[PDB]
Amino acid sequence: PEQYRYTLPVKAGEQRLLGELTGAACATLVAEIAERHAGPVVLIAPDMQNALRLHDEISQFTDQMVMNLADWETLPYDSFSPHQDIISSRLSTLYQLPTMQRGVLIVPVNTLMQRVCPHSFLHGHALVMKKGQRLSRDALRTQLDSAGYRHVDQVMEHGEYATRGALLDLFPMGSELPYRLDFFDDEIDSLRVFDVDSQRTLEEVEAINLLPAHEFPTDKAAIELFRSQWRDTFEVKRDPEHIYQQVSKGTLPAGIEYWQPLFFSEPLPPLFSYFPANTLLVNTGDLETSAERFQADTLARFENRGVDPMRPLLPPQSLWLRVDELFSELKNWPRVQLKTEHLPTKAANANLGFQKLPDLAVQAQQKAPLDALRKFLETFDGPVVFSVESEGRREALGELLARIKIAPQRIMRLDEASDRGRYLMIGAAEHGFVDTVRNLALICESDLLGERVARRRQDSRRTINPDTLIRNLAELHIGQPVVHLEHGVGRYAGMTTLEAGGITGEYLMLTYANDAKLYVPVSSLHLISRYAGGAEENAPLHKLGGDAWSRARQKAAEKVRDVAAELLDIYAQRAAKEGFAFKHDREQYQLFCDSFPFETTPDQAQAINAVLSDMCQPLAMDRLVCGDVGFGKTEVAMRAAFLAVDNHKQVAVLVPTTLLAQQHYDNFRDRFANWPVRIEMISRFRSAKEQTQILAEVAEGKIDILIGTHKLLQSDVKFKDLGLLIVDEEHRFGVRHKERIKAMRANVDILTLTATPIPRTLNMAMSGMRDLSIIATPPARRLAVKTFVREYDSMVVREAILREILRGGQVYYLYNDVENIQKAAERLAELVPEARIAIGHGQMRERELERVMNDFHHQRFNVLVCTTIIETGIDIPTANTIIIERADHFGLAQLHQLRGRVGRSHHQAYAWLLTPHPKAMTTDAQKRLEAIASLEDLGAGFALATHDLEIRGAGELLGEEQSGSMETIGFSLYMELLENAVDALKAGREPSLEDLTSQQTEVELRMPSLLPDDFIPDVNTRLSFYKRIASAKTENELEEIKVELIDRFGLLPDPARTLLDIARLRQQAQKLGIRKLEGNEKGGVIEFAEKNHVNPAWLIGLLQKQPQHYRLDGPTRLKFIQDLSERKTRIEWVRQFMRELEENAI
């Protein structure tokens, strides 16, 4: 009858406690408490941990606005400023808050106690701009400088704006995405949104709001104000590093935000000052415990960090509220309190009917795995609603529920749930609850399949193109190894501007041996490619004009053919031999899978089905799968074996080292735990006697799965019916054994595994030569990651850990490995009692892996001590600070590999490469470090190193012999020869298809052909376009590029149109022959190729009707005389002439 037990509070200090709630309970409650209340709802969260998890949950049960006031995520009086996306987010929220009419906003007690800027600030320093305002570009540019934005070239992050002639790109603080203006005679023409990666313009827009670029003014005034009030509060010092001194010179020190006060005359108000009048607060946990713990750490830091003579600190009063004022302010608003525990019948309380779901998990042991769920469903009256995270997970339920004759009906809003209905809604809800009050059931995947693991696979956000960076040499730094087809491997030296026949042209400088400097015409850039070899440190330095190259370029083609051959007949042969089909049985299979309740990656499943199929076809299988150590990469091998044993066939698994064997042994035992499958291992961990007693059981057919070292090769092991061979990391067994392997390979299906992945490109090539399935490592993204190189200093380690923990994240802690990893763990828990340490042993078993992953998803542990790089490979998304105790003994290879393990979009991630006393460090290592210490974010180098890696993988797949030519000419060209040698050996011809050499076309019209300095100032940016244009190949590729240019830099100069146009002629030139075409003021000279498409009837008819315009010169040239006095005329005619030439061709 009353819609509910509770009634909403309306007056200051009026609580309305609600009790006995469980899982997605609050979630759904805050959602309701938001729909019945004309006003806003500020949901104070006890810890940042909860809030972030809350935003996604509440969002499931409402079409309302679920918002979040972000926290600086820095440490009180930190040495780091907030990350932009955080400040942008805040400014957005504060700015809108007062006019907030409906919805939810989530604030951590942490953040709520922090003081905000005066609402005078935002309201006043705010501005707008529309489709046609009277603001000149160079004006706004100055305005932007006052607002405190930064002039940049590219404009990638919030708070920046860039200049490029007719255009203006800015990423305004209150917005989600950046804007590209474009002006017209002092009047702003249009406004366009644009992607920072693409840089292209997406949607068309008509308006833009412009908030400041900080939560505190930076204009001329502010700084004078800052100086004053400073002098008013602390002593001053000349020293160039004193905050005063710095803020004066127009510089913004790092921990500035904790000085916000001084940028204002007024005090900083209490966040509440922004809450609308009809705002309703909502609680969780007990704020007072939290609120006090913070006040304690704030004060704690106020004394310790308050010693730097260059950074005197402000009193905690100016920045934060007292636990008193917090509740003092808190008393002014009505506020529903949410509690889990049962409530005592006080009239102002409620006690919503919510209970913990039954025990519905799946049991792989029981002969009816899903009956708990089956009977619970045929024993319920009300609705069931099954919650799922992805539209790809919804699919998983179907496959699951189908086995109990249930195909749920989709809801959207919970209200659509009537009786006996079985519903399913897509949402972030972790796990269920029961609804006494209205008898409703909510079942999330976790309640049904153990417990999820926290990883999200979409990267689209910031994906760095493997191609781009390499195909277009996008971030080429002076000194990096470059490759010229004609000469070899040099080193980028920059770009210059020289003089030809009185026409300025641009050139790419490349140094070679003995500082021999080669100058490359921008128009010939197509003969250039970035060096690839997995070893950047070691790159050939060919001598310019030397013989070496031309040779190496051949030796390589030689080997590449041998390889393409050896493979091609071997694949062909195995394709003509009869093997063994394996049947399958979808049912038996599905049951095995029961013992693995986890979502498989798409790359992954692709592989499983791939491996399974090859097994079911009447031909011996011989696949290779290249993945990582992500939770579940073992599943392929697992399922492979399940299939061979379900067919009563023994399985052998070879591994390089015992530790691996053991690991493999373990994993197998735990995977087939619910099956009568006998498993055994032969390795150092077995005396001779036992080896004997085992091999014996093997011959008898009593062992379904044997696992062993090379010792499994040493002996002449007899199997009663071997059908599957699984070799892990074959590449590292060593000559003698490798042979013994290809020997134990015939007559049986084979499955080879390996970590090191392979390049996408080398994949399409192999198709038909080697069966391969690749489990790609998620793309490299451009993420905020500050890297530091410090000498071990515990106070750093400590603050470092702390800083992550206070934001609800975890920390990786790769260690030295001198002592006992168990002591290091203690030694660190002592240092940081606020934290809780876990350990991560090498060769983690899947079981260990999921335990650690889960514990971390439940904040159960917030620091993980590691011993190896591979361990740091674990998948934890909230681990965004990685510490490396003895970083010195690691190569860029690995650092980078480590550096990237941290990182979350819209948030700052850190990495502390720790070192020893300068005298214990190797001169080489020191320089190696300082190099990375120079990187400000995770961009190129990482994505590039990710590339190198895949190359070593390539080397491994093909051979130490191939890794050589790969290292000698550059993976780029190697694949060039290969892709060729293959297509060739396939069609039936021969590899000497050294056709690789270009038509050597040269189309010069004695006019400027280039991208002008003041059109595209960034040298490097230009360079990319050159290569792109040089390399373009169709007429459409050049237009696309043209469009990009105009859309990103506007009006196309003349040297530009030219560049492009000539580029197009040069093409037409090839399609038609023409090994050269010079043009000038007076006419020109076409130089044709032996094989051309010039119709003689046409030419001869041209020679006679127009004598004074065309004369032959030699059996190959054709001179032409015309009035090409003006640059625009010349080009026009030459194009027209090409047109006419091809329209008559033969």
Curated annotation (Swiss-Prot):
Chain location of the short sequence motif DEEH box per the record: 728-731
Chain's role: Couples transcription and DNA repair by recognizing RNA polymerase (RNAP) stalled at DNA lesions. Mediates ATP-dependent release of RNAP and its truncated transcript from the DNA, and recruitment of nucleotide excision repair machinery to the damaged site. Can also dissociate RNAP that is blocked by low concentration of nucleoside triphosphates or by physical obstruction, such as bound proteins. In addition, can rescue arrested complexes by promoting forward translocation. Has ATPase activity, which is required for removal of stalled RNAP, but seems to lack helicase activity.
Name of this protein: Transcription-repair-coupling factor
GO biological process terms held by the UniProt record: DNA damage response; DNA repair; nucleotide-excision repair, preincision complex assembly; regulation of DNA-templated transcription; transcription-coupled nucleotide-excision repair; transcription-coupled nucleotide-excision repair, DNA damage recognition
Residues the entry annotates as binding ATP: 627-634
EC category: hydrolase
Family: In the N-terminal section; belongs to the UvrB family.
Annotated GO CC locations: cytosol; DNA repair complex
Primary location recorded for the protein, binned into one broad class: cytoplasm
Highest taxon of the lineage: Bacteria
EC number: 3.6.4.-
Compartment annotation: Cytoplasm
UniProt keyword Nucleotide-binding present: yes
Species whose genome carries this gene: Escherichia coli (strain K12)
Subunit architecture: Monomer. Interacts with UvrA and RNAP.
Residue span, Helicase C-terminal domain: 797-950
